[PDB]
Write a protein that binds this ligand. Structure first.
Ligand SMILES: [Zn+2]
Lengths: 32, 1084, 19, 49
């Protein structure tokens, strides 16, 4: 499974979260 | 490839190997294959030196099925004095080829029967428990120098207070070996003129001719006149070889045969009843399918197809009592040792984390609360102050997952919230931080298994509100300001919490609301089934056999249920705690010193905490019970639960104990270690912080199909299941317990009656310090044969093993107890030991024991009377007239001025050193150097002869020919000098030799003689002669070859209580032990 | 230990040969 | 007993434990005594182990 772990690594790389609103937004609420 | 289980195979030899697991004729344990993917998983035993691409079996499995080729016997006949004679007929002549006459019995002067365990056998795995005996001319003291005489003043003798212990351990080894199913091995037809047309058995090996004469005494003819060739002439001719074979078969060889061969009833009875025990565990692959399908709670459907056959056996069916007793042993393992609890809870926590669909994300609280806030300008806001406590970091949530895993083990460990998760220093309402600390604490409490968690939930607030509201109490020293951590036992529960009418709403309008909300909306316990009751049994003590007591209510599971469901219990609890925390702040009656109005910010952030979305109250209410029901039957320690109560003070379990003794006895109160806890069990601290963060934030993945997720997650942990090895081990544990209570009661004072077979073998009233040492040897002898390296009977040996029956119990608060006593089913090793004790009561001789006593006295004559069997002239007893019985106070006064020295009779008189006397054996050990100074000159020369009453004794022999002089003083005095106060050297005899021709008549002097009959281990004297003129004669024992000399006898018949026979029916088998396969299919 | 404790109890009273 | 030699004390403690071979005055005493009064005869075992 030496070659197969590369496929597992890439398939766990490509599932990144599309939304990164984890930081605070109350410096942007004021400007909005 | 295989079309049965749909496995891809490569070589046709591998196809023929793979269909053998299905039963089609052409080193694994389980072989599972999935249905939606391509990944077979195969278990293999963990002791292999080179594991590769496979899964291990870490459970300590016992070795039940073990096969035997060779003779099914344990008694061999050895020659003692070899003597060849002139022979009439030398060999058989067919045409020119000569064939040598082979005798079944050793042609010698004196043949005896000694006991070597199996002595001719082909075995794939030996039990490492041999009862090996030397011939009786050799020394025979190392068999009794074994258990407890480990400090002995004389290293060549055995302690006479330990005969019964050593003999019972020998019988336990003799029963614990010959635990073999014998193997069908293949035959060969004969056309010898004395065995014509009889399919004889043939051992495996390089030569089969080696064993034919040793098996079959019939096969050698009668060519001459001798003690064997007048016996074969009396024998019968149609009883040799195979008697009855099976009907069904494979290939050409049958499934089982009945063969006639040399054996003995004592071995073949033990092996027959061992086979009868193992056949009663036979399971069906259809029942395997039913077991796993019912156990998986849905979500998969296994199947296990097979070919029709009868000789397969899969021993896996036990009873509920045999499961419960091993559960009691696993509970007694711990004894307040948290080290044996820790890896269990930690690994169940890790497994329960990796199965679960839920991931605890940190971002739900962070997308709402916003650490920025700064409502006021002086200090921190409420929103930024709760986040400094919650700390939504991704460290771990072991305090949540271990809290879930602790629901399974209630009567062992109890989960509490740790100290210093409470408010510091009592806490006050006027502080900002203590309100959020109370919020975190009161939200985290209802997951603990602590039965006083509602009283802690009330009294944290009642402690925090000292100086604004007052409640009544009862004691005037347990006031309102007592710390909430100290209310850990149900006697501390206040009556003001019990009856909430006593809390006046004028004085405490918020404590009244909190005491009402606890009594109304605290979560309700519930229960759910798991596993299978009929197969796999159930280790459920105090509960019905398929229930899992949960401290939370459950509904059937769906994913499209709304998040703000106030019918859900934990969501209701969060909403009510947030509402009361709002109503506390709304008035500003309780916070002077807040120089600005923080009530708006506080009420807003409590609204946010109330209306946060998180699917952990969905998860803990729907999908966590079915996951506990799936995990729980595949555990090493199956769940030991004690009933959850909500607020019933009248029943709260406070103490769990295990009772070793019987029911109708009054002994010392031997309370177990587990009663010595403040709580019901071992304490267990948890952090309320991580529990509260886990409740407030947790979500599913966006593509969650339960029939995908759970059918996937169930498959590898059922492929690495260990239910079967545990079911095999619990038989051995529940059998060893009954073996212990049967064998210790033979050597100690216990009111438990079992059948009391041997008493004449003397011993002592054993205390606990002696019985524990005996039971340790019993334990390691049980472990060595069944190949174990873990616990078995080891929690029993923690003081006082003199016990009768295992029992477990707890009590409520009001004093009502519950006594669960599992009934003991039919043991096998115990009553096989009892059978061989009954048989040893009749052949005491063959193991090197005599009955009775010793007469030490000079007998000088010519006669050949063989002192194993004396005439009634020399023996005497207590009833013989003129015989002086001697008690303990044998005191010797010397004679003055030529008078004879005298010794004290037990009637008070003084008798001279003359006549027929009686000793107990203990006197000679009390005064062993004073006595033989005084008595040896009178035994050797004078008329003094002495009975020594001792019961049992080992013995050795010394043959002499009676054509010359013989004197037994150099042996008798050598025996009498060596008896120390703690051991006896084995009693030396000398008996004459037997000859055919008449001999000279030389005088001989014998001192040590027996009293009762002892010449039983002698097989046959002078086996090649026509007769024995001079000496003790003995024919071939016709009473042991019953089915050859009695014409009216069925071949099944055995006279096993009186005398074991040495030739009978034995039934040889050819079974199959296939591995355990299944095809796990997914359900839509 | 128990072995020492038993061995002393047995070896406390033994008897030897004359002179 | 704990100490250097507990071998010596086992004859000082128990006079009726000895054998009685003699008509010496010690043995005339010991032969006229009760057997079951030696060692422990009562205990209070409240907890196992
Ligand atoms: Zn297959």
């Amino acid at each position: 499974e030496i070659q197969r772990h590369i496929t597992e690594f890439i398939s766990s790389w490509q599932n990144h979260p599309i939304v990164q609103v984890s930081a605070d937004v109350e410096n942007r609420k004021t400007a909005q | 490839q295989c079309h049965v289980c749909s496995a891809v195979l490569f070589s046709p030899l591998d196809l023929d190997a793979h269909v053998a697991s299905h039963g089609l004729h052409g080193r694994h344990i389980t072989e599972f294959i999935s249905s939606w993917q391509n990944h077979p998983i195969v278990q293999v035993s963990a002791d292999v030196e080179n594991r590769k691409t496979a899964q291990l079996l870490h459970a300590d499995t016992p070795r039940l099925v073990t096969w035997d080729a060779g003779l099914c016997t344990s008694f061999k006949i050895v020659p003692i004095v070899p003597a060849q004679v002139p022979q009439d007929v030398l060999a058989y002549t067919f045409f020119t080829s000569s064939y040598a006459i082979q005798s079944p019995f050793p042609e010698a002067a004196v043949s005896r029967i000694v006991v070597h365990t199996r002595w001719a056998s082909n075995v794939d795995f030996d039990r490492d428990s041999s009862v090996i005996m030397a011939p009786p001319t050799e020394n025979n003291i190392h068999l009794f120098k074994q258990l407890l005489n480990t400090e002995t003043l004389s290293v060549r003798g055995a302690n006479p207070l330990m005969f019964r212990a050593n003999v019972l351990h020998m019988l336990l080894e003799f029963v614990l070996d010959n635990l073999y199913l014998n193997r069908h091995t293949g035959f060969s037809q004969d056309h010898t003129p004395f065995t014509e047309g009889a399919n004889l058995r043939s051992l495996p090996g390089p030569d089969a001719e080696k064993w034919y004469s040793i098996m079959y005494p019939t096969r050698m003819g009668t060519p001459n006149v001798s003690k064997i060739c007048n016996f074969v002439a009396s024998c019968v001719r149609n009883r040799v070889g195979r008697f009855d074979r099976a009907q069904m078969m494979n290939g050409a060889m049958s499934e089982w045969v009945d063969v006639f061969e040399t054996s003995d009833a004592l071995t073949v009875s033990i092996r027959g009843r061992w086979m009868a025990r193992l056949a009663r565990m036979n399971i069906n692959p259809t029942e395997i399918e039913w077991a796993l399908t019912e156990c998986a709670q849905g979500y998969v459907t296994v199947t296990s197809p097979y070919a029709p056959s009868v000789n397969r056996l899969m021993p896996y069916r036990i009873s509920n009592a045999e499961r419960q007793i091993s559960q009691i042993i696993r509970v007694m393992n711990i004894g307040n040792n948290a080290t044996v609890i820790q890896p269990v809870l930690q690994d169940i926590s890790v497994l329960l984390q990796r199965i679960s669909p839920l991931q605890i994300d940190p971002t739900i609280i962070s997308n709402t609360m916003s650490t920025v806030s700064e409502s006021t300008t002086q200090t921190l806001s409420p929103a930024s102050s709760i986040l400094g406590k919650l700390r939504p970091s991704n460290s771990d949530f072991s305090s949540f997952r271990v809290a879930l895993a602790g629901w399974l083990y209630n009567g062992v460990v109890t989960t509490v919230i740790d100290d210093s998760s409470y408010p510091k220093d009592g806490g006050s309402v006027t502080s900002l931080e203590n309100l959020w600390d109370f919020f975190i604490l009161a939200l985290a409490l209802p997951l603990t298994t602590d039965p006083c968690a509602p009283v802690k939930a009330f009294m944290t607030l009642a402690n925090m509100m000292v100086g604004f509201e007052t409640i009544p109490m009862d004691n005037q020293i347990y006031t309102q300001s007592r710390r909430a951590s100290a209310f850990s036992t149900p006697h501390t529960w206040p009556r003001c919490f019990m009856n909430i009418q006593l809390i006046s709403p004028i004085d405490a309008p918020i404590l009244r609301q909190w005491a009402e909300i606890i009594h109304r909306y605290w979560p309700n316990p519930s229960q759910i089934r798991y596993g299978t009751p009929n197969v796999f049994g159930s280790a459920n003590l105090f509960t019905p056999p398929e229930v899992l007591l949960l401290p939370i209510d459950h509904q059937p599971a769906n994913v499209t249920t709304p998040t703000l469901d106030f019918t859900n219990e934990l969501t209701n609890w969060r909403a009510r705690v947030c509402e009361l925390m709002k109503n506390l702040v709304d008035n500003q009656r309780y916070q002077p010193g807040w120089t600005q109005s923080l009530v708006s910010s506080m009420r807003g952030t409590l609204g946010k905490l109330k209306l946060i979305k998180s699917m952990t109250p969905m998860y803990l209410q729907q999908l966590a019970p079915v996951e506990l029901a799936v995990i729980a039957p595949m555990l090493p320690f199956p769940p030991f639960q004690v009933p959850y109560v909500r607020l019933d003070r009248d029943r709260v379990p406070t103490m769990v104990g295990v009772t070793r003794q019987s029911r109708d006895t009054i002994t010392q109160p031997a309370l177990s270690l587990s009663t010595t806890n403040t709580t019901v069990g071992v304490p267990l601290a948890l952090d309320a912080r991580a529990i509260t963060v886990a409740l407030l934030s947790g979500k599913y993945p966006p593509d969650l199909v339960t029939n995908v997720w759970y059918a996937d997650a169930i498959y590898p942990m059922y492929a690495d299941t260990e239910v079967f090895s545990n079911l095999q081990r619990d038989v051995i544990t529940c059998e060893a317990v009954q073996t212990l209570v049967t064998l210790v009661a033979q050597i100690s004072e216990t009111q438990y009656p079992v059948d009391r077979y041997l008493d004449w073998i003397p011993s002592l009233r054993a205390s606990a310090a002696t019985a524990a040492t005996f039971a340790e040897w019993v334990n390691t002898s049980m472990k060595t044969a069944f190949d174990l390296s873990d616990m078995l009977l080891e929690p029993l040996l923690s003081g006082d093993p003199r016990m009768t029956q295992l029992a477990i119990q707890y009590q409520q608060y009001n004093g009502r107890t519950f006594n669960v006593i599992p009934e003991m089913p039919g043991s096998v090793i115990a009553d096989c030991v009892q059978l061989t004790a009954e048989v040893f009561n009749h052949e005491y001789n063959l193991f090197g024991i005599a009955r009775g006593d010793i007469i030490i006295g000079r007998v000088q004559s010519t006669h050949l009377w063989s002192p194993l069997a004396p005439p009634p002239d020399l023996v005497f007893d207590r009833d013989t007239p003129g015989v002086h019985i001697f008690g303990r106070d044998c005191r010797i006064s010397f004679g003055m001025n030529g008078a004879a020295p005298m010794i004290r009779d037990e009637t008070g008189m003084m008798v001279p050193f003359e006549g027929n006397w009686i000793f107990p054996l203990a006197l000679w050990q009390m005064n062993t150097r004073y006595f033989n100074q005084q008595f040896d000159a009178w035994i050797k020369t004078g008329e003094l002869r002495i009975r020594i009453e001792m019961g049992a004794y080992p013995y050795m022999l010394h043959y002499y020919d009676p054509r010359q002089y013989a004197n037994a003083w150099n042996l008798t005095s050598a025996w009498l000098e060596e008896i120390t106060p703690t051991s006896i050297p084995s009693v030396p005899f000398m008996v004459p030799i037997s000859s055919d021709h008449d001999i000279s008549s030389a005088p001989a002097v014998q001192y040590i003689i027996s009293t009762e009959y002892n010449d039983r281990s002698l097989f046959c004297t002078n086996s090649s002669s026509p007769q024995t003129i001079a000496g003790p004669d003995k024919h071939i024992p016709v009473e042991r070859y019953n089915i050859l000399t009695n014409p009216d006898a069925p071949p099944t018949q055995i006279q096993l209580p009186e005398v074991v026979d040495l030739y009978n029916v034995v039934t040889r088998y050819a079974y199959e032990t296939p591995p355990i396969t299944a095809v796990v299919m997914g359900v839509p | 230990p128990m072995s020492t404790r038993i061995a002393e109890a047995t070896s406390a009273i033994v008897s030897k040969h004359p002179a």
